């Protein structure tokens, strides 16, 4: 049985993307310190421990699942789109996610807010004319107070509806004070939608929308994500495990249940 690792994860021959201090999801939404991972691609994306978010307090229900779907796709290729938000102020941002000289936010998200006196009833529609699926990612904002709610979105209680021809998610914000994170008691909640060719993404809301800037090009799940603090070395190796590289010469390995590439069967 194969029962030992070098301890490193060889840079060759699988394109191994070390996220350093960004997890995949932070790199996806675009946490200011993961701007480096934009449009990056991989066979295996290793998430380290250092990893810490550092932007607007958010939670992703269906995290491990959204995490996996992106991990497999192996590309982070984002495609901007011409969304037309008429009646609201775009590019919103904050001090808990500074960028450049001040207030910042997730590069891949567009915080809409009221336009002076009002927040109209938003209702865009974006058709998928292309020959590949689209993975839009959006969010809903939960102010912690009715005051906050009304300063930003006017309406006393907002709503976000993200429909396609076959689905229909209608989440409604939930005002309340969550624990403080980077000075905030507020939170955004990350959701998603995949649009199949010949389909139409339809966003209708009247409050709390955290609008998409475009879509993520999805290829086929050949890649994979893995958590490890294993060093990376310049070497050739085919079987990668959280522990490192283990030769695929023997038919059964017992090093770990998780591995990448032509690997010995786990025991």
């Amino acid at each position, epitope marked *: 049985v194969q029962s030992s690792s070098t301890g490193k994860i060889c840079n060759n021959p699988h394109r191994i993307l070390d996220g350093i201090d960004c997890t995949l999801i932070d790199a996806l939404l675009g946490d200011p310190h993961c701007d480096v991972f934009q449009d990056e691609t991989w066979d295996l994306f290793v998430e380290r421990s250092k990893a810490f978010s550092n932007c607007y307090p958010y939670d992703v229900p269906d995290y491990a699942s959204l995490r996996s779907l992106v991990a497999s796709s192996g590309t982070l290729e984002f495609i901007t789109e011409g969304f037309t*938000w*008429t*009646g*609201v*102020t*775009q*590019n*919103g*941002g*904050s*001090n*808990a996610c500074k960028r450049g000289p001040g*207030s910042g936010f997730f590069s891949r998200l567009n915080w809409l*807010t*009221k*336009s*002076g*006196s*009002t927040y109209p009833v938003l209702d865009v529609t974006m058709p998928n004319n292309d020959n590949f699926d689209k993975l839009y990612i959006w969010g809903i904002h939960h102010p912690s107070t009715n*005051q*906050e709610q009304t*300063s*930003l979105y006017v309406q006393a209680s907002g709503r976000v509806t993200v429909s396609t021809r076959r689905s229909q998610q209608t989440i409604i914000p939930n005002i309340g004070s969550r624990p403080w994170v980077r*000075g905030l008691s507020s939170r955004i909640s990350i959701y998603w939608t995949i649009v199949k060719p010949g389909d139409v993404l339809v966003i209708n809301s009247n409050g709390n929308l955290i609008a998409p800037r475009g879509y993520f090009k999805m290829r086929t799940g050949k890649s994979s994500i893995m958590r490890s603090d294993a060093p990376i070395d310049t070497c050739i190796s085919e079987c990668i495990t959280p522990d490192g590289s283990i030769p695929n010469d023997k038919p059964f390995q017992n090093v770990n249940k998780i591995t990448y590439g032509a690997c010995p069967k786990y025991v």
Partner: antibody
Amino acid sequence: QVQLKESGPGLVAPSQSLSITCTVSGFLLISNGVHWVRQPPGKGLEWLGVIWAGGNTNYNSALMSRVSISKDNSKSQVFLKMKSLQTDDTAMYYCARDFYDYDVFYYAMDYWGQGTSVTVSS
Amino acid sequence: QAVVTQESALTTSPGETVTLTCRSSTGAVTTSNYANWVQEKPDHLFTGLIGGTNNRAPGVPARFSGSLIGDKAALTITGAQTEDEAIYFCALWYSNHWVFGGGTKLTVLG
């Protein structure tokens, strides 16, 4: 950096139409609003109106019947158009950037333009 | 909409601690008004100083402070210097409509 410049006529005869332009740089008109402030010779400042990031505007109740703020988001230009001009309108016309803080929730006029003088004389 | 009123001019000397004030015909100046304090320097080159009542704008030296003193808003230059001579405009927000004050001329006897 932020920056606002006003380019206008300088001299227009009573009963014509004033048209100032505030060309902003370093921020987007969809991200912020742009305000118009005029300072007649030896007087205080007067707030003309404002065009919000969302395009809707809010004018000074008084002058509203003659004012009209517009903007071409793709050119980075805000437009202050006044009609039925009368001598009183001789003043410095300024456009200042509308700012709103998302964490404390307050409005403020942070970036003022350089201004452009307009004399209404026949 | 309402009428913001403030000192015509005020004459101080270097060192002293002056306090411009900002009144509302319509009543007390609350936080709802976002008291803005603009500083007009020679040849009308305006500069933002304080916003939202007491939030000091970046370049602004620490000695400038925004506050509510009773039912009117205030600005306090603590240790005025000759370089503080300027017309200090106060602006008050009343429902998507701004209303400036008459401005104050600040002399700093040098």
